[PDB]
Amino acid sequence: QTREVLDPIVASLMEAQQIPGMAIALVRPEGTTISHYGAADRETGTPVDDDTLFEIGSLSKTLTATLASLAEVEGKLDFDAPVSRYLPELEGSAFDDISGLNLGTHTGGGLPLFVPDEVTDRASLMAWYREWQPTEPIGESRTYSNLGIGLLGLETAASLDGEFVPTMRAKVLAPLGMQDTWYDVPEARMADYAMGEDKDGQPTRVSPGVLDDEAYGIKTTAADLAKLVRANLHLADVDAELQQAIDATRQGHYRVGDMTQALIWEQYSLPVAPETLRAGNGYDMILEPNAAEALEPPQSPRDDVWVNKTGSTNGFGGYIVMLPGKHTGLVMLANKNYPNDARVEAAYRILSGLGAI
């Protein structure tokens, strides 16, 4: 059926990229198909199954974005407001002039990609935010940042008078039915925690770091992710306020060349050539600052677009594509950090093989 298009491509991908295991989820209007390939851990050879848990890296940011969007829908968070309104420990800093919307679109004034070594806890972090000097015109330039979305995670928790992880579980994960989604994987499920493989073939797992939960910390199953995707595609039964929150994550906020930056989500209009997608998910977009044009009346969720997000850790590589107009989406989790190029090619072949493009 569906699985005839998918199995040869995945096989080819895993062989070409030396991927121990993958878990894939295809979301269609007539149902969601889950598929498991290879081993959860190369050394032991344990198969990937329904319960297998994957690091999703920066894919976590879609969750963070969603919870931010819900606090907005509940009228507890204004995206246009200075971030210091909700984190008064940052009054007087650059964040009097930087908004939650900026942070959610990586247009917060040049905020760097990584958390500095100097920063080792909340106090030292807030301190650093207070000290930091913007290096790019706020709301005009895009630099992919963990400090940025990490801070939006903090701002959101503050505006909801709760702690991040429990709030996330209560307001987003539980209602979406995401019962296998963990920030800290419990001892009981450690057997189901896949082992990573880095690009030198060594086994890796993610270490704790500051802002990990907010920026890259989730471990989960392809099915659970498929619930988030199902909701974006209007294929799930979900609270009205939550469904508004999710939809707003897909609002166009900035034009960045061929890419439109939604709230975390990144999208390309259709039809789209793989090269556009390789470039948009490549070096010039991820690791350089890019001019960004504010879409002033925001722009509603589009039905003629390729929406995606990549995510990685040293040992895992995830990718999510959504076609809102075709009510189709794809989740590809792997326990190997393989190139974004390969992710884009695989996702593309798969989706045209099913005539969603």
Side-chain angles (χ1 to χ4, degrees):
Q1 46 167 19
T2 279
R3 56 148 183 68
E4 287 185 313
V5 177
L6 201 60
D7 298 358
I9 295 181
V10 181
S12 191
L13 172 61
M14 293 179 63
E15 205 78 341
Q17 294 304 334
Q18 289 325 185
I19 303 162
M22 296 188 74
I24 296 180
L26 184 83
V27 176
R28 283 222 189 191
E30 63 276 4
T32 296
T33 296
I34 314 309
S35 287
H36 293 113
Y37 309 75
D41 180 343
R42 205 189 271 289
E43 169 177 350
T44 76
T46 318
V48 177
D49 55 36
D50 290 352
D51 302 321
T52 303
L53 292 175
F54 282 84
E55 298 176 9
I56 66 175
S58 303
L59 277 180
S60 301
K61 296 182 187 175
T62 57
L63 276 308
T64 304
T66 297
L67 174 67
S69 189
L70 188 59
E72 187 278 340
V73 163
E74 293 183 351
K76 314 221 192 81
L77 175 69
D78 186 23
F79 279 166
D80 298 318
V83 164
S84 58
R85 299 292 172 72
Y86 303 88
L87 295 167
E89 49 197 327
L90 297 181
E91 292 250 355
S93 65
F95 297 99
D96 284 339
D97 314 311
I98 295 172
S99 74
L101 180 89
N102 291 129
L103 298 180
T105 58
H106 312 281
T107 52
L111 261 187
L113 177 59
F114 299 121
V115 187
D117 307 331
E118 354 168 10
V119 176
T120 57
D121 59 17
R122 188 168 194 289
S124 57
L125 177 67
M126 291 307 172
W128 183 100
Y129 279 131
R130 264 191 301 271
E131 305 306 336
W132 168 79
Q133 306 295 116
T135 58
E136 297 296 337
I138 295 168
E140 292 178 26
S141 156
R142 179 194 187 271
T143 296
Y144 189 72
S145 167
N146 282 356
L147 289 161
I149 177 67
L151 180 59
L152 171 61
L154 292 192
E155 192 194 12
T156 297
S159 74
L160 291 173
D161 279 290
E163 285 174 354
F164 186 80
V165 173
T167 302
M168 182 62 78
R169 188 182 303 275
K171 306 186 64 61
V172 183
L173 298 179
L176 284 169
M178 292 175 71
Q179 314 292 134
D180 290 303
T181 301
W182 308 93
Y183 284 93
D184 293 273
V185 179
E187 285 303 319
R189 297 278 306 257
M190 286 299 297
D192 297 314
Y193 193 164
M195 189 51 79
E197 186 163 285
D198 63 21
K199 46 187 102 186
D200 282 332
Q202 233 59 11
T204 263
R205 206 154 266 179
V206 71
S207 317
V210 6
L211 291 176
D212 49 15
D213 295 325
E214 292 75 6
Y216 52 83
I218 292 180
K219 302 106 200 156
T220 181
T221 205
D224 267 24
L225 272 181
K227 300 190 177 75
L228 181 57
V229 173
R230 226 180 284 119
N232 273 272
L233 295 171
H234 291 272
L235 297 177
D237 195 60
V238 174
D239 170 46
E241 280 195 346
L242 184 50
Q243 185 68 67
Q244 290 176 235
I246 284 171
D247 288 341
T249 70
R250 282 187 282 111
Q251 273 169 225
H253 288 299
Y254 290 87
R255 195 186 63 90
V256 192
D258 292 320
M259 186 212 70
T260 301
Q261 177 66 71
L263 194 89
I264 288 303
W265 291 114
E266 295 175 22
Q267 72 183 15
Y268 302 84
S269 60
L270 297 172
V272 73
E275 218 48 33
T276 300
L277 299 180
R278 296 184 133 106
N281 292 109
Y283 178 105
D284 291 334
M285 187 67 66
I286 295 160
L287 298 173
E288 294 187 339
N290 284 301
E293 193 193 271
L295 298 169
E296 265 319 328
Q299 182 183 113
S300 323
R302 293 179 55 184
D303 63 347
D304 60 326
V305 288
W306 170 296
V307 182
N308 64 2
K309 184 80 180 74
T310 51
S312 310
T313 58
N314 298 334
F316 294 79
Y319 189 41
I320 294 177
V321 183
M322 301 183 296
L323 293 328
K326 292 280 157 75
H327 300 90
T328 300
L330 171 68
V331 181
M332 298 177 26
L333 301 185
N335 58 350
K336 171 60 159 289
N337 195 341
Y338 66 106
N340 278 357
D341 281 333
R343 298 177 210 207
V344 167
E345 193 185 328
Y348 197 97
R349 285 174 172 290
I350 292 174
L351 294 164
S352 62
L354 308 171
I357 53 178

PDB file of all heavy atoms in Angstrom, residues 280-296:
ATOM      1  N   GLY A 280      17.375  25.914   2.344  1.00  0.00           N
ATOM      2  CA  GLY A 280      16.668  26.493   3.476  1.00  0.00           C
ATOM      3  C   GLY A 280      16.939  25.769   4.746  1.00  0.00           C
ATOM      4  O   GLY A 280      16.914  26.367   5.809  1.00  0.00           O
ATOM      5  N   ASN A 281      17.244  24.481   4.633  1.00  0.00           N
ATOM      6  CA  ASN A 281      17.681  23.682   5.749  1.00  0.00           C
ATOM      7  C   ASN A 281      19.191  23.485   5.785  1.00  0.00           C
ATOM      8  O   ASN A 281      19.706  22.635   6.480  1.00  0.00           O
ATOM      9  CB  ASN A 281      16.955  22.370   5.722  1.00  0.00           C
ATOM     10  CG  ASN A 281      15.460  22.523   6.006  1.00  0.00           C
ATOM     11  OD1 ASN A 281      14.627  22.366   5.126  1.00  0.00           O
ATOM     12  ND2 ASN A 281      15.118  22.834   7.248  1.00  0.00           N
ATOM     13  N   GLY A 282      19.921  24.321   5.085  1.00  0.00           N
ATOM     14  CA  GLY A 282      21.358  24.229   5.095  1.00  0.00           C
ATOM     15  C   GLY A 282      22.076  25.374   5.811  1.00  0.00           C
ATOM     16  O   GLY A 282      21.463  26.232   6.441  1.00  0.00           O
ATOM     17  N   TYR A 283      23.395  25.407   5.623  1.00  0.00           N
ATOM     18  CA  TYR A 283      24.352  26.335   6.262  1.00  0.00           C
ATOM     19  C   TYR A 283      23.947  27.795   6.157  1.00  0.00           C
ATOM     20  O   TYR A 283      23.903  28.474   7.144  1.00  0.00           O
ATOM     21  CB  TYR A 283      25.739  26.131   5.618  1.00  0.00           C
ATOM     22  CG  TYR A 283      26.822  27.034   6.121  1.00  0.00           C
ATOM     23  CD1 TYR A 283      27.812  26.565   6.995  1.00  0.00           C
ATOM     24  CD2 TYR A 283      26.894  28.367   5.721  1.00  0.00           C
ATOM     25  CE1 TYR A 283      28.827  27.413   7.449  1.00  0.00           C
ATOM     26  CE2 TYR A 283      27.905  29.212   6.165  1.00  0.00           C
ATOM     27  CZ  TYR A 283      28.865  28.733   7.030  1.00  0.00           C
ATOM     28  OH  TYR A 283      29.819  29.625   7.500  1.00  0.00           O
ATOM     29  N   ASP A 284      23.636  28.276   4.955  1.00  0.00           N
ATOM     30  CA  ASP A 284      23.383  29.710   4.773  1.00  0.00           C
ATOM     31  C   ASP A 284      22.183  30.191   5.552  1.00  0.00           C
ATOM     32  O   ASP A 284      22.109  31.376   5.913  1.00  0.00           O
ATOM     33  CB  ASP A 284      23.176  30.081   3.324  1.00  0.00           C
ATOM     34  CG  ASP A 284      24.397  29.964   2.523  1.00  0.00           C
ATOM     35  OD1 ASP A 284      25.506  30.081   3.075  1.00  0.00           O
ATOM     36  OD2 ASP A 284      24.266  29.780   1.311  1.00  0.00           O
ATOM     37  N   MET A 285      21.238  29.305   5.825  1.00  0.00           N
ATOM     38  CA  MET A 285      20.112  29.664   6.656  1.00  0.00           C
ATOM     39  C   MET A 285      20.386  29.431   8.162  1.00  0.00           C
ATOM     40  O   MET A 285      19.970  30.225   8.978  1.00  0.00           O
ATOM     41  CB  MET A 285      18.860  28.898   6.222  1.00  0.00           C
ATOM     42  CG  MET A 285      17.588  29.320   6.911  1.00  0.00           C
ATOM     43  SD  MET A 285      17.014  30.961   6.551  1.00  0.00           S
ATOM     44  CE  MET A 285      16.602  30.755   4.802  1.00  0.00           C
ATOM     45  N   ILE A 286      21.021  28.334   8.518  1.00  0.00           N
ATOM     46  CA  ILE A 286      21.121  27.957   9.910  1.00  0.00           C
ATOM     47  C   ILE A 286      22.183  28.733  10.657  1.00  0.00           C
ATOM     48  O   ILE A 286      21.982  29.096  11.803  1.00  0.00           O
ATOM     49  CB  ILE A 286      21.412  26.456  10.024  1.00  0.00           C
ATOM     50  CG1 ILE A 286      20.228  25.717   9.474  1.00  0.00           C
ATOM     51  CG2 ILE A 286      21.721  26.043  11.453  1.00  0.00           C
ATOM     52  CD1 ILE A 286      20.539  24.299   9.077  1.00  0.00           C
ATOM     53  N   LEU A 287      23.309  28.982   9.997  1.00  0.00           N
ATOM     54  CA  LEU A 287      24.507  29.464  10.633  1.00  0.00           C
ATOM     55  C   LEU A 287      24.974  30.810  10.116  1.00  0.00           C
ATOM     56  O   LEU A 287      26.102  31.186  10.374  1.00  0.00           O
ATOM     57  CB  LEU A 287      25.631  28.443  10.386  1.00  0.00           C
ATOM     58  CG  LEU A 287      25.379  27.076  10.974  1.00  0.00           C
ATOM     59  CD1 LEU A 287      26.461  26.158  10.515  1.00  0.00           C
ATOM     60  CD2 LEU A 287      25.353  27.174  12.497  1.00  0.00           C
ATOM     61  N   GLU A 288      24.156  31.524   9.374  1.00  0.00           N
ATOM     62  CA  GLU A 288      24.437  32.934   9.058  1.00  0.00           C
ATOM     63  C   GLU A 288      23.183  33.771   9.339  1.00  0.00           C
ATOM     64  O   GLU A 288      22.106  33.215   9.419  1.00  0.00           O
ATOM     65  CB  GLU A 288      24.885  33.080   7.628  1.00  0.00           C
ATOM     66  CG  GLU A 288      26.226  32.413   7.394  1.00  0.00           C
ATOM     67  CD  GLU A 288      26.811  32.676   6.018  1.00  0.00           C
ATOM     68  OE1 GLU A 288      26.008  33.026   5.132  1.00  0.00           O
ATOM     69  OE2 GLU A 288      28.068  32.490   5.821  1.00  0.00           O
ATOM     70  N   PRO A 289      23.323  35.097   9.569  1.00  0.00           N
ATOM     71  CA  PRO A 289      22.145  35.936   9.765  1.00  0.00           C
ATOM     72  C   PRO A 289      21.558  36.259   8.420  1.00  0.00           C
ATOM     73  O   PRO A 289      22.275  36.406   7.454  1.00  0.00           O
ATOM     74  CB  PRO A 289      22.691  37.186  10.435  1.00  0.00           C
ATOM     75  CG  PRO A 289      24.057  37.262   9.948  1.00  0.00           C
ATOM     76  CD  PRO A 289      24.555  35.855   9.777  1.00  0.00           C
ATOM     77  N   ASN A 290      20.256  36.332   8.353  1.00  0.00           N
ATOM     78  CA  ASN A 290      19.563  36.529   7.099  1.00  0.00           C
ATOM     79  C   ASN A 290      18.590  37.693   7.275  1.00  0.00           C
ATOM     80  O   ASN A 290      17.940  37.813   8.301  1.00  0.00           O
ATOM     81  CB  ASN A 290      18.773  35.272   6.725  1.00  0.00           C
ATOM     82  CG  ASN A 290      19.638  34.162   6.198  1.00  0.00           C
ATOM     83  OD1 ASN A 290      20.269  34.370   5.257  1.00  0.00           O
ATOM     84  ND2 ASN A 290      19.669  32.999   6.815  1.00  0.00           N
ATOM     85  N   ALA A 291      18.501  38.549   6.273  1.00  0.00           N
ATOM     86  CA  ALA A 291      17.520  39.605   6.281  1.00  0.00           C
ATOM     87  C   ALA A 291      16.147  39.000   6.417  1.00  0.00           C
ATOM     88  O   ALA A 291      15.839  38.020   5.750  1.00  0.00           O
ATOM     89  CB  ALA A 291      17.620  40.379   4.986  1.00  0.00           C
ATOM     90  N   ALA A 292      15.318  39.569   7.272  1.00  0.00           N
ATOM     91  CA  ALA A 292      13.935  39.078   7.441  1.00  0.00           C
ATOM     92  C   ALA A 292      12.918  40.229   7.313  1.00  0.00           C
ATOM     93  O   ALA A 292      13.031  41.215   8.003  1.00  0.00           O
ATOM     94  CB  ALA A 292      13.775  38.367   8.786  1.00  0.00           C
ATOM     95  N   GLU A 293      11.911  40.042   6.465  1.00  0.00           N
ATOM     96  CA  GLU A 293      10.904  41.039   6.189  1.00  0.00           C
ATOM     97  C   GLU A 293       9.627  40.746   6.974  1.00  0.00           C
ATOM     98  O   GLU A 293       8.893  39.822   6.674  1.00  0.00           O
ATOM     99  CB  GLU A 293      10.625  41.055   4.687  1.00  0.00           C
ATOM    100  CG  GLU A 293       9.816  42.240   4.190  1.00  0.00           C
ATOM    101  CD  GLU A 293       9.316  42.024   2.754  1.00  0.00           C
ATOM    102  OE1 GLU A 293      10.064  42.400   1.816  1.00  0.00           O
ATOM    103  OE2 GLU A 293       8.194  41.473   2.569  1.00  0.00           O
ATOM    104  N   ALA A 294       9.341  41.549   7.975  1.00  0.00           N
ATOM    105  CA  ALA A 294       8.114  41.355   8.774  1.00  0.00           C
ATOM    106  C   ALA A 294       6.871  41.376   7.911  1.00  0.00           C
ATOM    107  O   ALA A 294       6.660  42.323   7.201  1.00  0.00           O
ATOM    108  CB  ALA A 294       7.995  42.399   9.868  1.00  0.00           C
ATOM    109  N   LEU A 295       6.092  40.296   7.978  1.00  0.00           N
ATOM    110  CA  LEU A 295       4.825  40.201   7.280  1.00  0.00           C
ATOM    111  C   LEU A 295       3.762  40.889   8.164  1.00  0.00           C
ATOM    112  O   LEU A 295       3.232  40.265   9.095  1.00  0.00           O
ATOM    113  CB  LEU A 295       4.430  38.748   7.050  1.00  0.00           C
ATOM    114  CG  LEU A 295       5.364  37.925   6.182  1.00  0.00           C
ATOM    115  CD1 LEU A 295       4.978  36.449   6.274  1.00  0.00           C
ATOM    116  CD2 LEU A 295       5.383  38.407   4.761  1.00  0.00           C
ATOM    117  N   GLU A 296       3.467  42.164   7.885  1.00  0.00           N
ATOM    118  CA  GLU A 296       2.784  43.022   8.891  1.00  0.00           C
ATOM    119  C   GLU A 296       1.319  42.701   9.216  1.00  0.00           C
ATOM    120  O   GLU A 296       0.963  42.616  10.387  1.00  0.00           O
ATOM    121  CB  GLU A 296       2.959  44.523   8.614  1.00  0.00           C
ATOM    122  CG  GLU A 296       4.128  45.113   9.407  1.00  0.00           C
ATOM    123  CD  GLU A 296       4.232  44.604  10.851  1.00  0.00           C
ATOM    124  OE1 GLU A 296       3.190  44.307  11.475  1.00  0.00           O
ATOM    125  OE2 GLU A 296       5.363  44.495  11.372  1.00  0.00           O
TER     126      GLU A 296
END
